[PDB]
Copies of this chain bind each other. A is one copy, B any other.
Amino acid sequence: MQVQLVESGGGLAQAGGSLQLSCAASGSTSRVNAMGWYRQTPGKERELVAAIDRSGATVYSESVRGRFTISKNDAKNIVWLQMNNLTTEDTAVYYCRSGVLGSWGLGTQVTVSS
């Protein structure tokens, strides 16, 4: 029922180097309009690293801004995490997670003057 995800990439890198992770979705992909990467370093809580939605909007944790990039190939149903300028603080297990985001409401208008 849920979309099937296969996570690839990772292994060893040198400090200063780069790695690319990938996550391939298959099965019930039509409803999936969000994908995200988390990580967990030993002893610490799992944290959200990067996320992307179907429109291409992206968001990153402070700890990886500018160094990591999340991208997608919509037709292949694959998302990548490019990880640049690595340090030993990036050692962790990385998790790909799917999401189904809901409909748009009307929203609320915010006007800031002066």
**Which residues in A have some Cβ–Cβ distance to B below 8 Å?**
2-3, 5, 7-15, 17, 19, 21, 34, 36, 38-40, 45-48, 50-51, 53, 55, 57-62, 65, 83, 86-114
Contacts and interface: CB of A to CB of B under 8 A. Distances in A.
A15 B55 CA distance: 30
A48 B61 CA distance: 13
Contacts of A90: 110, 112
Given A15-B114, A91-B112, 19 more contacts: A5-B102, A5-B105, A7-B108, A9-B108, A10-B108, A10-B109, A14-B113, A21-B108, A36-B101, A38-B57, A47-B57, A50-B59, A87-B112, A89-B112, A90-B110, A93-B108, A94-B110, A95-B107, A96-B107
10 contacts: A3-B102, A14-B113, A15-B113, A39-B110, A62-B65, A90-B110, A94-B107, A95-B104, A96-B107, A97-B104
